[PDB]
Write a structure and sequence with these properties.
2 copies of one chain form a homodimer. Chain A is built from 8 helices and 10 strands. The first copy, chain A, is of the alpha/beta class and 209 residues long. In chain A, 42% of the residues are buried. Chain B: It holds the Pfam family AA_kinase.
Chain lengths: 209, 211
């Protein structure tokens, strides 16, 4: 079975360790990159010039490919810009990096606007692969409670995560619609992701129906 | 506007200038999806005579649709697009675009990589991605016949598979149903028929609707 893992931009500079540990696992893994250290730059173009939402989305999308190429270069994991070639790589190695832009712009099925991020790209890719496990690797232990000084939520269901400042808002529709188990975990603690994949309990937020 | 997906069969390769000329004239958002034009025999010849496998033949057949697309573009002046994002931009300024389907089909890989899934299924898939409700399949006959020779033209295919005699993918009705798409099989030698389908005017064709 295939597992989709998305690596946040927050983890860009602590990525070599996480990638090292994922290579060690005997699991089919599909790595989806985020905007790495390029997000500020895309935001700077949108904010300070007449580049509009569709342009900024095309550009942000291609920034995920770049982050992908970075992951590949420091790790030796192969890239694929199409799921057909990604599956061929996985029938011989355990792990591949998706360069998502080709897929996202090919289909264009989700509303192409800010507040559709690589989290939704990873979920979309999980739906295309018929993957049932999506892991979102961030720089914190999971999702913290809506009120100020809120605690870590170990569980949040699709309906609850409505009206959350810090959430992709397209993501819960995909998780529910396509029956995907979603985990938000601290990528600074690679062991936790090993544990999710080996069905061992650890610290994270599970987003369920 | 609303978008209409028209698939042009390989049987129409050498009567494509006429068809493309007439589609340009229509005041309708049209997405052209090509078939294997005059290249299908060659892909089949590789599969049949050598160790080329089903996945190889599918990758290759897929790229043959792009080629046919480029041919359509060259003889017509209609713009191409290998991604639906750019296809939508072209349609906000012109009425008609040719999809080069390979990038989309291999990107997603959601369809069975299988010899009974051709550009007919690719066209339906693309219609689903665009939320198009109309798929027109242009072939070299008046629609789907029960048999050959001297078959009878069928009105409506209402089963999950196509029993009769046609180039159309046997499993296409499952996709038509899944996607909630109106599907028409029409003679592309007679472009006025496609004008009439799009203007809701009576004409000769076979419908595909899962009753």
């Amino acid at each position: 079975p295939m597992h989709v893992i998305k690596i946040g931009g927050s983890l860009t500079f602590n990525s070599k360790n996480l990638l090292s540990k994922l290579i060690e696992l005997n699991k089919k893994i599909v790595l989806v990159p985020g905007g790495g250290n390029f997000a500020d730059s895309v935001r700077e173009l949108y904010d300070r010039t007449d580049l509009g939402e569709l342009g900024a989305h095309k550009i942000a999308t291609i920034c995920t490919d770049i982050t992908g190429i970075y992951f590949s270069e420091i790790s030796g994991i192969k890239t694929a810009n199409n799921l057909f070639d990604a599956k061929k790589i996985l029938e011989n190695e355990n792990i591949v990096i998706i360069l998502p832009s080709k897929i996202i712009l090919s289909t264009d099925e989700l509303p192409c606007s800010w507040s559709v991020t690589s989290d939704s790209f990873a979920a979309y890719i999980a739906k295309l692969l018929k993957s049932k496990v999506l892991i979102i690797a961030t720089d914190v232990d999971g999702i913290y409670d809506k009120y100020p000084e809120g605690k870590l939520l170990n569980t949040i269901n699709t309906k609850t995560i409505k009206g959350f400042t810090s959430v992709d808002k397209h993501l819960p529709k995909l998780i529910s619609e396509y029956g995907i188990e979603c985990f938000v975990v601290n990528g600074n603690h690679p062991e936790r992701i090993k544990n999710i994949l080996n069905d061992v309990s650890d610290t994270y937020t599970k987003i369920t129906l």
